[PDB]
Structure formats: C-alpha cells, structure tokens
Symmetry: C2
C-alpha cells in the first residue's frame, strides 16, 4: 500500500485539488483514499471508514 498512515483530520473541500480512491487489490488489502491538497500539492491519506470522509465524497 502507499499509505504509511492515514489522517482523521477533516479536509476542507475548498483546499482539495484532487481525491483518488484506490480499490482494495492484491498489492494492498484495503481501499486507500489519497487527497492531493491545493496548498502545496501535499498528499494525505484519508480514513475510508471515518464519517468525515464518507460525507466528503458525498458532497462531490
């Protein structure tokens, strides 16, 4: 997997440049949500189980 850790902090959708969802595969046993922030092109994994994340996708 690419995520060494995942953040539980809410992401401001206005600061989000891109969000990539990577389905659970053979290379990685869990779904990974990677957010690319506008700020400084900083990547950050989000919690696919968190509620703050479940909604984030809904909004978009």
């Amino acid at each position: 997997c690419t995520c060494i850790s995942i953040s539980n902090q809410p992401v401001n959708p206005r600061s989000l440049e891109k969000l990539e969802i990577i389905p659970a595969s053979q290379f990685c046993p869990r779904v990974e949500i990677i957010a690319t922030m506008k700020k400084k092109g900083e990547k950050r994994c989000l919690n696919p189980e968190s509620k703050a994340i479940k909604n984030l996708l809904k909004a978009v």
Copy 2:
C-alpha cells in the same frame, strides 16, 4: 478541464485500478471524474451527474 467527453456507461468495478475526483476550480467549472482501468491503457471520464457512477 481534461474531460472533453463524459461516459454514461458503467465501469466494471473489477477492472478499476483507481478513480480520481477533481472538484471544480477556476480552471475547470465542473467536477471531473476519471476511472483508470487495470489494462489496455484505458481511462474513462465518468458522468458526475449520474447516480449510477456513484454505484
């Protein structure tokens, strides 16, 4: 904007490598959704205004 065409044809979840969601910006007025498949170098821009795409 990178999606000049958007598809209404559902993607086989098994063939999906990843899905990218790009919210609207000052460079592109709409949200763009792109699925990258596992083979054939295939990518597909999906209709965000499609409930099916949310399936």
